[PDB]
C-alpha cells in the first residue's frame, strides 16, 4: 500500500508530539565527584556517595 | 551464470586492433571519422 | 451393492434424445453370454418408432448352441438379430444389406419424391465394455476410435463418416440408475462393464464358483492342476502359494474373463 496523499505540516507536527527524551536521574556528587547518576558510581572516581570504587 | 563479457587481450587486438582496421577500406574510413571528431583514443 | 452411475451417463441420455431426429437406423449391441440381462430397458424406453437390429458381439467366447437358440428366440420374438465377432470380421459383411432392406421403404419413397439416394445414418448403443468402438474401427478399417480393456474409455459421442455410404454415431455405455435383481448385477459384474473398484469381488467369485459347480462340473474338475469339488472355496484358493487369504479371488476372476476355461454362457 502506498500513501494516497501527502501529509500536511500540521499533521506531522501533531504526530511528533510524544517523540521526545526524558531528563535523567540527578543525585549528589560522590566523594566530591561530578553529579553522579542514581544507584551508580561517581564520574570522578567511581564513588558511591563517597564510597569510591574502580 | 556466464556474463557476456569474458575479457581476453589477444582477441581484442586481433579484432578491434589498429592493423585490423588498417587492413580493409571500411576500417580506414572508421579511422578517418574518428580522426575528424578528434577522439583522444582511436582503434584499440 | 452395485450403484455405479456417473454424470456422463446422465448426459448421454440427454444428448441422444436431443439428436434423435437425424438417426435413420439403430444398432443395439448386446453381449452373447448374457443376452437377456445385458439389455437396457431405460434406453429402450427412449428408443421407439425406430427400426433396430440386435447384435451379439464377443460371440467367440460363448457356446454356439445357446447363442443360436437365443438368436432364434429374438427372431421369432419380432426383432432381427445377428451374431458377430468384432475382433475378426465374421458376420460384419451381412449388416449393410440388412440395413438397406430395412430402410428400403423410406429410400424408395424419397427416390420417387425426386432426390438422389444418400448415406445411411446409424447410431450404435449399448452397455459399456462391449465392442461398440472396436466394431466401428473394423467397419471403417481406419482405427479411429479409442479402445481399452476396461469400462468407461470413451466419454463423448462422435460422428464417423465411413465413405459415402455410412454415417455412424458412437456413444459411451449407459447403465440404469438403480438395479433391481441382484443376479443380473452379479452377471454384469462378472462380464465386466463395471469399474470393479466399486463392487465386492468376493461375492462375484462365490457366484462364479457356484455357477461352475452347478453347470460345468467337468470344467471345474480340470480347473488348473487340481481335481476336487469340496463344499467351500478355500480348497481351490490355496493351490499355489503368509499367503493371500482371499486375494486369490482376483485370480479366480482374472482367468475366467480371459477364457482360460473353455467357452461357456450364463444365459
Amino acid at each position: 500500500a502506498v500513501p494516497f496523499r501527502r501529509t500536511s505540516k500540521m499533521k506531522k507536527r501533531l504526530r511528533r508530539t510524544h517523540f521526545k527524551l526524558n531528563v535523567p536521574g540527578m543525585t549528589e556528587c560522590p566523594s566530591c565527584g561530578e553529579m553522579k547518576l542514581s544507584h551508580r558510581v561517581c564520574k570522578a572516581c567511581g564513588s558511591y556517595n563517597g564510597k569510591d570504587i574502580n | 551464470m556466464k556474463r557476456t563479457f569474458q575479457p581476453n587481450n589477444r582477441k581484442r587486438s586481433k579484432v578491434h586492433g589498429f592493423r585490423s582496421r588498417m587492413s580493409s577500406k571500411n576500417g580506414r574510413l572508421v579511422l578517418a571519422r574518428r580522426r575528424r571528431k578528434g577522439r583522444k583514443v582511436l582503434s584499440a | 451393492t452395485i450403484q455405479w452411475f456417473p454424470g456422463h451417463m446422465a448426459k448421454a441420455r440427454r444428448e441422444v434424445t436431443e439428436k434423435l431426429k437425424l438417426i435413420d437406423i439403430v444398432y443395439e449391441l448386446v453381449d452373447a453370454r448374457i443376452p437377456m440381462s445385458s439389455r437396457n430397458p431405460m434406453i429402450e424406453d427412449i428408443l421407439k418408432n425406430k427400426p433396430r437390429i440386435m447384435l451379439l458381439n464377443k460371440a467367440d467366447k460363448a457356446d454356439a448352441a445357446v447363442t443360436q437358440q437365443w438368436k432364434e428366440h429374438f427372431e421369432n420374438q419380432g426383432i432381427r438379430s445377428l451374431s458377430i465377432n468384432s475382433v475378426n470380421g465374421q458376420g460384419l459383411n451381412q449388416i449393410v444389406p440388412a440395413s438397406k432392406e430395412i430402410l428400403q421403404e423410406k429410400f424408395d419413397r424419397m427416390r420417387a419424391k425426386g432426390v438422389k439416394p444418400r448415406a445411411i445414418r446409424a447410431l450404435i448403443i449399448g452397455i459399456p465394455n462391449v465392442g461398440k468402438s472396436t466394431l466401428i474401427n473394423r467397419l471403417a478399417k481406419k482405427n479411429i476410435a479409442k479402445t481399452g480393456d476396461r469400462p468407461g474409455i470413451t466419454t463423448s459421442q462422435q460422428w464417423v463418416k465411413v465413405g459415402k455410404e455410412l454415417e455412424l454415431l458412437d456413444t459411451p455405455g449407459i447403465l440404469w440408475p438403480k438395479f433391481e435383481d441382484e443376479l443380473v448385477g452379479l452377471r454384469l459384474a462378472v462380464t465386466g462393464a463395471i469399474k470393479d473398484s466399486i463392487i465386492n469381488l468376493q461375492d462375484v467369485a462365490v457366484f462364479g464358483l457356484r455357477f461352475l459347480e452347478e453347470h460345468y462340473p467337468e470344467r471345474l474338475k480340470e480347473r488348473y492342476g487340481l481335481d476336487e469339488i469340496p463344499e467351500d472355496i478355500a480348497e481351490l484358493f490355496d493351490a499355489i502359494g503368509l499367503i493371500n487369504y482371499d486375494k486369490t479371488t482376483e485370480v479366480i476372476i482374472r482367468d475366467i474373463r480371459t477364457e482360460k476355461f473353455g467357452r461357456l454362457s450364463f444365459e
Binding site: - | - | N200, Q202, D203, V206, E231, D232, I233, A234, D246
Partner: protein, 122 residues
C-alpha cells in the same frame, strides 16, 4: 475413542472377523464413541460360508478400547485392543459365545445377556 473408518475386531462366533464403522448413533453431530455405545458397521472380513457375509451392514456394541472408562471412585480401566459384539435391535447376542474379558459398564446399560455369556468380567 472409536470414530468413522476405525477397524475393530469381533469377539463372537458369528463368522465376521473384522468390521469398519460407518456412523455413530445418538446425536446430531456426535463423532466419538466409548465403551458401552452402539455403532453401525460394515463387515470387511468373513468366511465364504457362514451366518454373516462380507459387505453386510450390521450394528454392534463396543466392549474393549485402548482408552477405557473413568469410574466414579477414581479407578481407571484399559485394554489392549478394540472389540465389538454384533447385536440385534433388541440388544441380544447374534452369536453364541463371547471371547475374552468384558468391561463391567455394559451391565449398567441393560446388556445383561452379553455380560452373562462373558467368561470373565472386569
Amino acid at each position: 475413542m472409536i470414530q468413522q473408518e476405525t477397524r475393530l475386531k469381533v469377539a463372537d462366533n458369528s463368522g465376521a472377523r473384522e468390521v469398519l464403522t460407518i456412523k455413530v448413533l445418538g446425536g446430531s453431530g456426535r463423532k466419538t464413541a466409548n465403551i458401552g455405545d452402539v455403532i453401525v458397521c460394515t463387515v470387511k472380513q468373513a468366511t465364504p460360508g457362514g451366518v454373516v457375509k462380507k459387505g453386510e451392514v450390521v450394528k454392534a456394541v463396543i466392549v474393549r478400547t485402548k482408552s477405557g472408562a473413568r469410574r466414579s471412585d477414581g479407578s481407571y480401566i484399559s485394554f489392549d485392543e478394540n472389540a465389538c459384539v454384533i447385536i440385534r435391535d433388541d440388544k441380544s447376542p447374534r452369536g453364541t459365545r463371547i471371547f475374552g474379558p468384558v468391561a463391567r459398564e455394559l451391565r449398567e446399560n441393560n446388556f445383561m445377556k452379553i455380560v452373562s455369556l462373558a467368561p470373565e468380567v472386569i
